[PDB]
Design a binder for this molecule. Structure first.
Ligand SMILES: O=C(NO)C1=CCCC1
Ligand SMILES: [K+]
Ligand SMILES: [K+]
Ligand SMILES: [Zn+2]
Length: 357
């Protein structure tokens, strides 16, 4: 009944040298860690060490060209770093960025290994830079390497190739990189909830719509839950879990659950515009703990209100430790567009998942 936790202050070294107030701040992870200490959650966890991902491990999901370019940034001058970052969509780079991305991935590898060998029951990874926008061949949206995708492949490499991994991505943005990496794969089920606005929300692609169900062998194994026209919160997320996430996940019967746990859908976030509460994230975590014999790894993605993300992720760790869920506020009726979204996903995925029929 042990919960693992990985945090390493070295991941704060990745920084924006032209805009020191950029929202993807070094103190995102130190604030989450501090709140775990304040709530006396840290002493209840087993500390898991960070490590660098190797280049061979990065190649589980990424091209050699992309790996080499980010690797080369470690020795670049600021003028090189500025121009290189501006080649990507929403990326800043410093001489420490590559090392920090390696530590984010390697920290999650060690956590998955601890879960899969039974050292811990579940775990939380307080890591940055985030990962779920990173593609096979390019960086994007503050992400260099796709930490969650890499962890799924790493998990398969130390168990068996066809280990069933569920990735639930509740960051407010679509994890375009994770979807693309696994789009043709039936061993990794990707489920994303995200603000969509008919494509008028980052990353601004109709790839995030509900009709993208996967390709080839992966048909049915990509579940997009897109939100339109509404300040979504606990009622909508609870409804999506009840009607979609949990029935599909139970039928898939994962052997490992990875959460791309961005907290930018949280009330107070400067970018997301949603109002999921810390108790809401607690309830989402508690439901996922009923899968995979409790083998859940919570990986920090986005989330930019330091107070909101600290309370929200700490509440997730409280759930992993076995604490009872806090009480939700009175769940208001769903925003009408959320009902439309959920019904659209149900129709798209009922062909592949008999639990939705
Ligand atoms: O939080 C994020 N992704 O999860 C952001 C990347 C670019 C703008 C917002
Ligand atoms: K998401
Ligand atoms: K998939
Ligand atoms: Zn995000």
């Amino acid at each position: 009944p042990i919960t693992g936790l990985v945090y390493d202050q070295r991941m704060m070294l990745h920084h924006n040298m032209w805009d020191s107030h950029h929202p993807e701040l070094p103190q995102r992870i130190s604030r989450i860690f501090s709140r775990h200490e304040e709530l006396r959650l840290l002493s209840r966890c087993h500390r898991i060490p960070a490590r660098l991902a190797t280049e061979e491990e990065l190649a589980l999901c990424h091209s050699s060209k992309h790996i080499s370019i980010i690797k080369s940034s470690e020795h670049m001058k600021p003028r090189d770093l500025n121009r290189l970052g501006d080649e990507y969509n929403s990326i800043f780079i410093s001489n420490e960025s590559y090392t920090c991305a390696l530590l984010a991935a390697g920290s999650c590898f060690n956590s998955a290994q601890a879960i899969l060998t039974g050292q811990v029951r579940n775990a939380v990874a307080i890591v940055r830079p985030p990962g779920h926008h990173a593609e096979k061949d390019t960086a994007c949206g503050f992400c260099f390497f796709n930490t969650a995708a890499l962890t799924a492949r790493y998990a398969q490499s130390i168990t068996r190739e066809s280990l069933r991994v569920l990735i639930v991505d509740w960051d407010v943005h679509h994890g375009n990189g994770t979807q693309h990496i696994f789009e043709e794969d039936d061993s990794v089920l990707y489920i994303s909830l995200h603000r969509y606005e008919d494509g008028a929300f980052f990353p601004n692609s109709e790839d995030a719509n509900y009709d993208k169900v996967g390709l080839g062998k992966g048909r049915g194994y990509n579940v997009n839950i897109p939100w339109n026209g509404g300040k979504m919160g606990d009622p909508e997320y609870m409804a999506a879990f009840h009607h979609l996430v949990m029935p599909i996940a139970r039928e898939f019967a994962p052997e490992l659950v990875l959460v791309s746990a961005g907290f930018d859908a949280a009330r107070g976030d400067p970018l997301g515009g949603f109002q999921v509460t810390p108790e809401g994230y607690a309830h989402l975590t508690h439901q996922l703990m009923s899968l995979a014999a409790g083998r859940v790894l919570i990986i920090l993605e986005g989330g930019y209100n330091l107070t909101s993300i600290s309370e929200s992720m700490s509440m997730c760790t409280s759930m992993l430790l076995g604490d009872s869920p806090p009480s939700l506020d009175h769940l208001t009726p769903l925003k009408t567009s959320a009902t439309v979204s959920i019904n659209n996903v149900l129709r798209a995925h009922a062909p592949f998942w008999s639990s939705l029929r």
